[PDB]
Design a protein around this nucleic acid. Structure first.
Ligand code: MG
Ligand code: ZN
Ligand code: ZN
Ligand code: ZN
Lengths: 107, 97, 85, 1405, 134
RNA sequence: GAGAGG
DNA sequence: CGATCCTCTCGAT
């Protein structure tokens, strides 16, 4: 987790994935002054396991494509540090049922 | 009277699949075209009463089917062919693999 | 291929409004075309009112094939399906 | 209609789009096509062996057609070919050609960056025949060379040629090298090669589409059925444009063939070559970049195949998605008090034109024989008898028309008869309720008659309206109408989870008049009224009065129309079970106890008679209830009378005097404020102009006046006032109407402001310049009764016009919205797994509406555990058996005293209580404001009330129940409320979730103390209630097959059409200016990056938000303040001595600023004392900010904050004079004094807030809130003093960018919701949720536009149905797309039963 | 008389209230061009023709026109004309399918080119009925 | 094409 | 490249 304060040179941007299996995640200090996950509008996102994703797809007779999607650069996906293919479970309050679970896949 | 898109929409909302088909076929157009099993085009030389059919080029004579579509759809598919586009109509979901 | 066995069926044990309408319609069509009637019509003549009777007394010999979004299906008989509505 | 075919019948399951190989065109061909001339060969009456006919269809109704015979109306027409002398381009593919050209090397014929490039590697990996090629082109368009070899040296296939900078010119390509034009034959040679592996990577198919096929070598010749003839006069030709253009391309081809094998003039040959291209392409598509088309004896230009398919009156929209149909009829409509709700009055002539094809069965043979005997001219008759073979016997001409011995299996096309289901419709069809099934009732006269209570779904009136009737021609098609589309089935609508039909006009008016305590009926009339009810038992009710004369009340006789077991309770304002005012409503067992019957009881209302009767008795019984009420009321009213005259608009002499004085005092308020504004005493509030402030005040005074005058009028009106009477019933008119007719019309508005100065400094040439008085700017002092003056008349006409202009716009605009909404959600439907999916099988919602409930089976119910104090909750739900004061009294239970003490039973009551306290906490976290009334399935209150009557519960005797019976009973009930059924954990938790809020409602209503003390149920009644909830819950579930996409679209779209006024009713305060209505709804749906009113709403620190001071501080901390905003003037003086001023005012400043080289040029700024005080600025702050910009390169001195005139003096530390004037620009325009960039105006607002008090109940606790003009969410949210948890923006695109897709979605709902709500309309959650989810599922915001949804992975035939028809179809062929035919549109195009409702499953034996 | 309907008195309608005359003129000319080829106003029979309307031509006099005072309805041919095809081709004009009335005035004149041209005025009296707008 | 109707 | 629906009548090419 690299916490830069003003900016990152696009030269340094082309060195981010060059050392796998390890992952490097860059976050502007200004973006972290407030934790977005504490906001009214942000529901709880749960990074579900590889096996949980496997059971989810089986239980709803799905394809990864048929699942609702979440962007790699999504403020929440970044916070959780989601990789593409990973599934997140969104537990949200509902005016209809009280509680509702949606699922989004990382792209 | 025109049974427009907006009316087509209300029949979908009601879930009246047959009434919607009847309006767009039995009332209005509805035409029987002969389709090739190979190229899937309205190529087939409809030689009714003499039981012959045949699609030249494909050298097909047995693999033939009859479909019920609006004349406007038949006209469209022909107009697409006129623009060098192949709207190949197939009678089986076969994605083979 | 594909098919779900009778044991393992997860769809509503209830007949849908769309199922009932298509069922009644198909049977009405049959009766309208001199097909045999599986119930004693008591002064009844309209094919639909007859199909409604055959539905009420569960003497409609049809099966609803319920497709799931992957392509698998659940075969339910008019006989087993509960008619609330 | 056609002959019998031996070939097997099958439907279309796939559409493989592609491109024609010239070799495939030649193979498919039947004709050579060498001549451009038609059919006349040297006068001879036949056909030419060139254009149209040589073996491909007759144009003379001749059974002859090249051996195939068949004749027209059977022959599909056959394709011929045409050999082009030189290769040609395709209009549509021109852009793809150039794009393919910028990807492959010319000469070399290979892709540019395979497969070492750490960009092209990632680009090649992406699965798509469009999105892969998108990345590829962008990557190798920059490349100018083929590249000799590649890095780790690595040697591969790559020549040494410079790739041209290709440019499109007219309809040809030009290449730049560092020149020469690009040939059509040249581009082919490159494309002819390529590579099967490389080309499939750039979006092509070896089998169906190759890039060499984008260039035309052999053009397909369409048959005559595509381009038919036949004129108006049978002496001349009359050919199709397509034929004229094909003759034109032939003339161009033979010319090229001549020139080539003749004297080739080198450059003059290319003049004919460019013209063959401006024919081949112009026949497929006219209206391009070049020039249009010629006359050719017809109306220029030529249409072209492209235009033929182009939407709205084009092959797709005008012929496939919609089309003119047989078995249709139309006329003027009329109302009918004496017609049943589900009926339709059919004119005899129409019943006689329209037919039903009935099969001859023993069950009808007698009736059919008689009908055939009556024939086509006597009504219950028929026209046509169809036998075996299919031959139609014309009953109006046949010589045997009076013979005919029917046989079983024959069909009789009988006339439309009483009770036949018919589809009745009113355009525009914004609703599914706009298109409903009725029972035919054949009547005299030429109009369609309809029941008055069906007028609303159709939005019909009888001022000239026309409606359409459609006749089902199949037994299953009639079943579909009677079982799905019927009027009674539609009474309670899913749009707003409430009835869409109610008692209106005369009936609504008379039902009130009948219901008055004063309203009494005598025997004679009573008897007639009773008989007028068809469901009447024959029993005369005992009269309310039995003394000097039997006298029945109106309430009494109207209760005959209400069926038994109907319970309704209301309470309006002063309703007290002794209902002093006769308000509220109490109906027990279908007998009205008290309450005047009006709109709240008998209208389209949420929990009224109609919503109740449908749910309790059923749709068929409810539709009888319409007629029954109509019959009694219409009769009583016919005999009572009801009028309205000029006298009903007249108020008292004294009222008028008071109205007159009310206006004169308003007139003085405006004068005083004017006089004050003109004296410079009026101070403007932060955020708004002195003139804006004035205008806001004047308008309030003026609106107040109209409202005060109007209220004065309304009060004066007696209960016998006919206008007052119609307002009381709710049949016509509101307050405004009374006020404007009787008291004062009021202020006229244009563009939300009072009448503008259209003449210089005046509204009219009858006024003097600069006159801001009410009369001058459009205030109508007079009422329509008194009459308007010419000035007033003109101004009212100006206001009037703005209304008609937007009416005209807020119809064509909303119509376009509605289309887009419908197209985007078309394919969304509920599947057999309770899931919500599109045609691709992609999930939109996992459970429909998040609860899997049908919107029409849901109603607003109070969540009893959420509200009240913690003490009230305790009193209501707590049972402490181990407490003498807090047990259940033995008078509530058979075990009462046997249980006092206990212990084992208190563990169960503690478990019961803990869940209720858990619920209260949970509900308060979901519904923050503490709103209890929410739409939920199963009306528990009603079920309870029904058990109370059914079992005849005596509130005196103790119950036979047990704590176990109640506690376990309710607990087991919860395990039986199925929405889903799978035995797995994912499904079991999804089920657990769906039913959470309903189980809350259930627990709150079925708690031990409630069941015992409140309801006082028995075991019998309790067990019945338990089973009634389960049965009604299971009924309330959505049916797989439900077409929710279209439902949602129409449920949002329809109200949008009814959205009146583009300008918001917030006319008082000028800071309320947020975009609303249809313009806003358009901003939301198009996902407009540049919205008109971007705004932040800032909630302060939880403390600390009541602190008016802390708010002012955060306002100045965030509002963007520059130097320009505080400066009066800037000057440049020549003050050469730095320590001696030339300016005598400044002297004192220079005395100081020496302790605790320069330039002789001084930059001197004067600041405004008031502006510096409006903002939280001091000279020191302004000065130190200028100082911290140029630091050392500028010298800044300044005057003190107390020092009379605010001055800042600057100096630069040859060619100096210009540099300073340059600095001043940066100083004013490019310097932030304080605030956040993009945040222009910040306003302090006091907001109301429902918050829980320390005793439990919700309390109104007001809070200071900041309202912004402009947006910077990221920056403002980090400002200290705010609540970063509550920060909001109407810029949902920014909420998306900062907080994520889920917060973006929630904000997008809030947005859509607000547009609907501002209009006062209500739409069910599930419809807007579905929209918002659809716009959301991709991880971003996809617009309801050709850019948004229409570019998605869906079927080519479904996308082309919307917009960009041809281009969608062109890329479909080029990319060689496959269409599932799983969507509605492709099935409508194919004339196949779509997998929608009825066809969303298969029927087997 | 709800939602914008009205109740009209039949008795006053019998006395003439809101009763009106309706006139419709139908026009035709003998051809546009043809040096020897000229259309003709006549009552057409067989002469191979078969392109007839019928709608009875039976109300036509020998000039191809109906005399004023004859009752016309349905698709009764009101102007009879033929196009010479080298036998006859029908160019007759039927009364508007939905209309009916009495032939009022029949004008036979000549155009500036010397064209025999006709105008036929037909007259209906419209009495206020149920779906009529006021 | 224009004029109109809801 | 979009730009309410449907309905009517008229005249002219
Ligand atoms: Mg109207
Ligand atoms: Zn073939
Ligand atoms: Zn043929
Ligand atoms: Zn090369």
């Amino acid at each position: 987790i690299f916490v830069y304060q003003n900016n990152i040179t696009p030269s340094a941007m082309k060195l981010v994935p060059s050392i796998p299996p390890a992952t490097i995640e860059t976050f502007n200090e200004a973006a972290l002054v407030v934790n977005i996950t504490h906001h009214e509008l942000v529901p709880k996102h749960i990074r579900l396991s590889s096996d949980e994703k496997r059971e989810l797809l089986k239980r709803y007779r799905l394809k990864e494509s048929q699942l609702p999607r979440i962007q790699r650069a999504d403020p929440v996906a970044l916070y959780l540090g989601l990789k593409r293919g990973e599934v997140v479970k969104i537990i949200r309050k509902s005016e209809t049922s009280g509680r509702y679970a949606s699922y989004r896949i990382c792209m | 009277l025109r049974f427009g898109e907006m009316e087509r929409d209300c029949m979908i909302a009601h879930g009246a699949a047959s009434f919607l088909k009847e309006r767009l076929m039995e009332a209005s157009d509805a035409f029987r075209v002969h389709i090739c099993g190979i190229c899937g085009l309205m190529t087939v030389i409809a030689k009714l009463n003499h039981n012959q059919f045949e699609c030249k080029g494909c050298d097909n004579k047995i693999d033939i089917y009859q479909i019920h579509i609006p004349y406007a759809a038949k006209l469209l598919f022909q107009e697409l062919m006129a623009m060098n586009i192949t709207p190949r109509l197939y009678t089986d979901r076969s994605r083979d693999f | 291929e594909k098919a779900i066995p009778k044991d393992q069926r997860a769809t509503t044990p209830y007949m849908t409004k769309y199922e009932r309408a298509r069922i009644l319609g198909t049977r009405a069509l049959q009766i309208s075309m001199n097909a045999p009637v599986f119930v004693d019509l008591e002064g009844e003549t309209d094919p639909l009112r007859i199909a409604m009777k055959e539905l009420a007394e569960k003497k409609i010999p049809l099966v609803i094939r319920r497709y799931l979004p992957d392509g698998s299906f659940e075969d339910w008989s008019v006989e087993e399906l509960i008619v609330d509505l | 209609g056609q002959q019998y075919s031996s070939a097997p019948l099958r439907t279309v399951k796939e559409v493989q789009f592609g491109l024609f190989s010239p070799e495939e065109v030649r193979a498919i061909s039947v004709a050579k096509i060498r001549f451009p001339e038609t059919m006349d060969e040297t006068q001879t009456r036949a056909k030419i062996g060139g254009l149209n006919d040589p073996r491909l269809g007759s144009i003379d109704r001749n059974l002859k057609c090249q051996t195939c015979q068949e004749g027209m109306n059977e022959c599909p027409g056959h394709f011929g070919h045409i050999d082009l002398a030189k290769p040609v381009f395709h209009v549509g593919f021109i852009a793809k050609i150039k794009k393919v050209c910028e990807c492959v090397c010319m000469h070399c014929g290979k892709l540019l960056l395979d497969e070492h490039n750490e960009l092209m590697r990632q680009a090649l990996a992406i699965k798509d025949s469009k999105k892969r090629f998108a990345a590829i082109w962008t990557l190798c368009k920059t490349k100018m060379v083929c590249e000799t070899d590649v890095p780790s040296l690595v040697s591969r296939g790559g020549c040494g040629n410079t790739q041209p900078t290709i440019r499109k010119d007219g309809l040809k390509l030009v290449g730049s090298w560092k020149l020469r034009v690009l040939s059509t034959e040249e581009i082919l040679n490159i494309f002819k090669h390529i590579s099967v592996k490389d080309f499939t990577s750039l979006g092509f198919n070896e089998v169906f589409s190759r890039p060499e096929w984008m260039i035309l070598t052999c053009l397909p010749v369409p048959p005559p059925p595509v381009r038919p003839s036949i004129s108006f006069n049978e002496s001349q030709r009359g050919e199709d444009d397509l034929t004229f253009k094909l003759a034109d391309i032939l003339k161009a081809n033979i010319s090229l063939e001549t020139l080539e094998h003749n004297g080739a003039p080198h450059h003059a040959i290319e003049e004919a070559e460019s013209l063959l291209q401006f024919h081949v392409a112009t026949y497929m598509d006219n209206d391009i970049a070049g020039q249009p088309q010629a006359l050719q004896k017809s109306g220029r230009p030529v249409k072209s195949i492209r235009a033929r398919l182009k939407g709205k009156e084009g092959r797709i929209r005008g012929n496939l998605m919609g089309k003119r149909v047989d078995f249709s009829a139309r006329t003027v409509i009329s109302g009918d008090p004496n017609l049943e709700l589900d009926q339709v009055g059919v004119p005899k002539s129409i019943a006689k034109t329209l037919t039903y094809p009935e099969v001859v069965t023993p069950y009808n043979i007698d009736r059919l024989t008689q009908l055939v005997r009556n024939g086509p001219n006597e009504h219950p008759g028929a026209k046509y008898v169809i036998r075996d073979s299919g031959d139609r016997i014309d009953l109006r001409y046949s010589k045997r028309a009076g013979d005919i011995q029917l046989q079983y299996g024959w069909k009789v096309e009988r006339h439309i008869m009483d009770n036949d289901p018919v589809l009745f419709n009113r355009q525009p069809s914004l609703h599914k309720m706009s298109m409903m099934a009725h029972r035919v009732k054949v009547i005299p006269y030429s109009t369609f008659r309809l029941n008055l209570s069906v007028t609303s779904p159709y939005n019909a009136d009888f001022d000239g309206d026309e409606m359409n009737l459609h006749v089902p021609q199949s037994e299953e098609t009639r079943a579909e109408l009677s079982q799905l589309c019927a009027v009674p089935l539609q009474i309670v609508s899913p749009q707003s989870n409430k009835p869409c039909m109610g008692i209106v006009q005369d009936t609504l008016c008379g039902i009130r008049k009948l219901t008055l305590r004063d309203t009494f009926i005598e025997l004679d009339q009573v008897l007639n009224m009773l008989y007028w009810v068809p469901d009447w038992d024959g029993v005369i009710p005992t009269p309310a009065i039995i003394k000097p004369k039997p006298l029945w009340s109106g309430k009494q006789i109207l209760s005959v129309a209400i069926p038994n077991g109907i319970h309704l309770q209301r309470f309006d304002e002063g309703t007290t079970l002794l209902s002093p005012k006769d308000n509220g409503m109490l109906i027990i067992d279908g007998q009205i106890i008290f309450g005047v019957v009006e709109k709240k009881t008998v209208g389209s209302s949420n929990g009224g008679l109609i919503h109740v009767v449908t749910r309790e008795k059923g749709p068929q019984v409810c539709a009888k209830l319409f007629g029954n009420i109509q019959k009694v009321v219409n009769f009583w009213l016919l005999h009572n009378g009801f009028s309205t005259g000029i006298g009903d608009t007249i108020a008292d002499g004294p009222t008028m005097r008071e109205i007159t004085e009310t206006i004169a005092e308003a007139k003085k308020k405006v004068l005083d404020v004017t006089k004050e504004a003109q004296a410079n005493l009026l101070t403007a509030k932060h955020g708004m102009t002195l003139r804006e402030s004035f205008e806001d005040n004047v308008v309030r005074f003026l609106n107040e006046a109209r409202d005060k005058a109007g209220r004065l009028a309304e009060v004066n009106l007696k209960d016998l006032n006919n206008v007052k009477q119609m307002v009381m019933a709710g049949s016509k008119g509101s307050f405004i109407n009374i006020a404007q007719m009787s008291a004062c019309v009021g202020q006229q508005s244009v563009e939300g402001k009072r009448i503008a100065f259209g003449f210089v400094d005046r509204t009219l040439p009858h006024f003097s310049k600069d006159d801001y008085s009410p009369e001058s700017k459009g205030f109508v002092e007079n009422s329509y009764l008194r009459g308007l003056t010419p000035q007033e008349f003109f101004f009212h006409a100006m206001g009037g016009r703005e209304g008609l202009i937007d009416t005209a716009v807020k119809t064509a605009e909303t119509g376009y919205i509605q289309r887009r909404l419908v197209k985007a959600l078309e394919d969304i439907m509920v599947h057999y797994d309770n899931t919500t999916r599109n045609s691709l099988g992609n999930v939109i919602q996992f459970i429909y509406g998040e609860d899997g409930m049908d919107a029409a089976h849901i109603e607003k119910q109070s969540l009893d555990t959420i509200g009240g104090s913690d003490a009230a909750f305790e009193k209501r739900y707590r049972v402490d058996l181990l407490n003498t004061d807090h047990t259940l009294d033995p008078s509530l239970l058979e075990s009462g005293s046997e249980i006092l003490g206990d212990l084992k039973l208190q563990v169960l009551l503690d478990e019961e209580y803990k869940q209720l306290v858990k619920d209260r906490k949970f509900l308060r976290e979901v519904f923050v404001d503490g709103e209890a009334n929410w739409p939920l399935p199963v009306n528990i209150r009603r079920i309870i009330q029904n058990a109370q009557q059914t079992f005849h519960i005596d509130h005196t005797k103790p119950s036979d129940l047990t704590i176990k019976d109640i506690v376990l009973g309710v607990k087991d009930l919860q395990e039986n409320l199925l929405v889903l059924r799978g035995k797995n954990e994912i499904i079991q938790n999804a089920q657990r979730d769906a039913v959470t809020l309903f189980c809350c409602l259930l627990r709150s209503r079925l708690a031990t103390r409630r069941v015992l003390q409140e309801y006082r149920l028995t075991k019998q009644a309790f067990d019945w209630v338990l089973s009634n909830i389960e049965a009604q819950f299971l009924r309330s579930v959505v049916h797989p097959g439900e077409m929710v996409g279209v439902l949602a679209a129409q449920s949002i779209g329809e109200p949008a059409t009814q959205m009146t006024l583009n300008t918001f009713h917030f006319a008082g305060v000028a800071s309320k200016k947020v975009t609303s209505g249809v313009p806003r709804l358009k901003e939301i749906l198009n996902v407009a990056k540049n919205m008109k009113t971007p705004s932040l709403t800032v909630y302060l620190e939880p403390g600390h938000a009541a602190d008016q001071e802390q708010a002012k501080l955060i306002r100045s901390a965030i509002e963007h303040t520059t130097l320009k905003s505080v400066t009066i003037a800037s000057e440049i003086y020549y003050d050469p001595d730095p320590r001696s001023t030339v300016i005598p005012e400044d002297e004192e400043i220079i005395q100081l600023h020496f302790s605790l080289q320069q330039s002789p040029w001084l930059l001197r700024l004067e600041l405004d004392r008031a502006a510096m005080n409006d903002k939280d600025l001091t000279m020191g702050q302004v000065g130190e900010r200028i100082k911290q910009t140029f630091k050392n390169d500028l010298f800044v001195i300044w005057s003190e904050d107390n020092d009379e005139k605010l001055i800042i003096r600057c100096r630069v530390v040859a060619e100096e004079d210009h540099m300073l004037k340059k600095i001043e620009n940066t100083m004013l325009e490019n310097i932030t004094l304080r605030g956040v960039e993009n945040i222009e105006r910040v306003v302090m607002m006091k907001y109301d807030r429902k918050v829980p008090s320390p005793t439990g109940e919700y309390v109104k606790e007001p809070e200071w809130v900041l309202e912004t003009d402009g947006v910077n969410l990221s920056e403002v949210m980090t400002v200290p003093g705010i609540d970063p948890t509550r920060i909001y923006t109407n810029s949902f695109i920014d909420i998306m960018e900062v907080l994520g897709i889920e917060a973006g979605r929630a904000a997008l709902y809030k947005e859509v919701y607000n547009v609907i709500a501002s209009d006062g309309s209500y739409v069910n959650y599930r419809h807007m949720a579905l929209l918002v989810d659809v716009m959301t599922t991709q991880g971003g915001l996809t617009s309801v536009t050709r850019h948004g949804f229409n570019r998605s992975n869906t079927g080519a035939l479904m996308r082309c149905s919307f917009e960009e028809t041809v281009e969608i179809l062109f890329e479909a062929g080029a990319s060689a797309e496959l269409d599932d035919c799983r969507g509605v549109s492709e099935n409508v195009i194919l004339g196949q039963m779509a997998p929608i409702g009825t066809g969303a499953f298969d029927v087997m034996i | 008389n709800q939602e914008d309907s009205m109740i009209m008195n039949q008795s006053s309608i019998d006395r003439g209230l809101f009763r009106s005359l309706f006139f419709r003129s139908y026009m035709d000319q003998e051809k546009k061009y043809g040096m020897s080829i000229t259309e003709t106003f006549e009552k057409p029979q067989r002469t191979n023709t078969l392109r007839m309307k019928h709608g009875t031509y039976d109300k036509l006099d020998d000039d191809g026109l109906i005399a004023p005072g004859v009752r016309v309805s349905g698709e009764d041919v009101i102007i009879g004309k033929t196009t010479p095809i080298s036998s006859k081709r029908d160019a007759s004009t039927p009364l508007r399918s939905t209309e009916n009335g009495i032939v009022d005035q029949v004008l036979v004149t000549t155009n500036q080119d010397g064209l025999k041209f006709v105008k036929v005025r037909v007259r209906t009296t419209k009495i206020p009925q149920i779906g009529d707008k006021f």
